Design a protein around this ligand. Sequence first.
Ligand code: GS8
Ligand code: GSH
Ligand code: BR
Ligand code: BR
Lengths: 211, 212
Amino acid sequence: VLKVYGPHFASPKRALVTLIEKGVAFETIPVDLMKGEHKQPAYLALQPFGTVPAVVDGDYKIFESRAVMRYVAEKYRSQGPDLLGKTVEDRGQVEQWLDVEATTYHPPLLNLTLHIMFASVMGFPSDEKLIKESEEKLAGVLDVYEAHLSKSKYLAGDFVSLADLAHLPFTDYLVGPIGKAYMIKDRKHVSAWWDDISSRPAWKETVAKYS
Amino acid sequence: VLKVYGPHFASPKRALVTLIEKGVAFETIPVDLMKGEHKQPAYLALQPFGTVPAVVDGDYKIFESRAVMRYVAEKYRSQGPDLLGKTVEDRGQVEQWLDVEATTYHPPLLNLTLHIMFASVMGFPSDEKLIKESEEKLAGVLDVYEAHLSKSKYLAGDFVSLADLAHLPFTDYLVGPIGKAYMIKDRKHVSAWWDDISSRPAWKETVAKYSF
Ligand SMILES: N[C@@H](CCC(=O)N[C@@H](CSO)C(=O)NCC(=O)O)C(=O)O
Ligand SMILES: N[C@@H](CCC(=O)N[C@@H](CS)C(=O)NCC(=O)O)C(=O)O
Ligand SMILES: [Br-]
Ligand SMILES: [Br-]
């Protein structure tokens, strides 16, 4: 059976929600950051960068949360919703917004996450200028989304996909523990899109089980 | 008919080398980054984040360099080398190392690119601490690569793929204009791997046509 490392962190939830959307069986295995488990040889043999998630599916090993998403959506393509779209062009749009999430959307949001949610618990001083910069930067990204989502129901078109799902875990933080829900709520089309994808049963189940 | 925007810059070269590898016919359209062409209404209708590349293919538009790679490799899958691998498991490994390049390899290398090659665009005084941090970070990533590449000929297995090619444009800066070639040279397997992918005819052609 397929196994996922680190379900309680945000990044692996990109993979968990995809597994649940596709109706795939899996088990999860915790990783104790506090005891440095992710920096010890056993976990490094799965994920050599020492970050989560890591996924082992029988003889097969794969890491990077969005790579895992793609692997699952391709392998189990014919069940559940098609999170890759139907055509090469559809899939191109999914990949495009998957890469926007990885390279443009996530990095400032990760900064807000580290400095607002884990400054205290990890023992880092909260970087107040970086917080202001990261928010301004994320707000510009969200303005682009707002325009796009007024002409398109989901990021890659009229169908929900991996690109939408990739936004769930850290945006859950943004509207929650990070305390900046207004960044989503104040943008009509972004806000309705968030209401849509974040109330899907697969995401609700992920959150009930792995928060 | 397929058109690539901003060929003289590094990120678009990811798309070009994939196009050339696949033997696809294309044209290029210059974008003047210095005068802010990429931040004006004409280019923003193509790429709403105002960066290059953007690709227009008949009725179809797509941006993000690695998405363009995936799109080209899939649309033309049945010609040239298969840069996506053969199986779902192979493609999984390609996607893994493509995402390592996007999220782990590239960010510190981009910081080195900006702050050393384009110092004036980042402003003065030069951020020497961020430069030192970026080099340390990239060196850590390169150590993982060295270990991995001692057990695997290319990143995703025994076949060259998008994941390897995605490394060409900025690593070319690293060993050249950035002036930190030892980061590759001092790592035996990384160095031999680099010698291999950067001597491919498609990469040689990309560089011959689109540098200045
Ligand atoms: N968004 C960031 C980095 C992207 C960038 O500009 N990259 C290079 C092109 S790499 O081949 C660049 O600075 N070009 C500027 C120029 O030549 O005018 C910034 O500019 O502040
Ligand atoms: N994630 C994007 C990044 C593209 C990118 O940053 N391109 C650079 C040139 S290499 C650019 O357009 N810089 C202009 C700017 O950001 O102002 C991709 O890979 O396509
Ligand atoms: Br965990
Ligand atoms: Br150009």
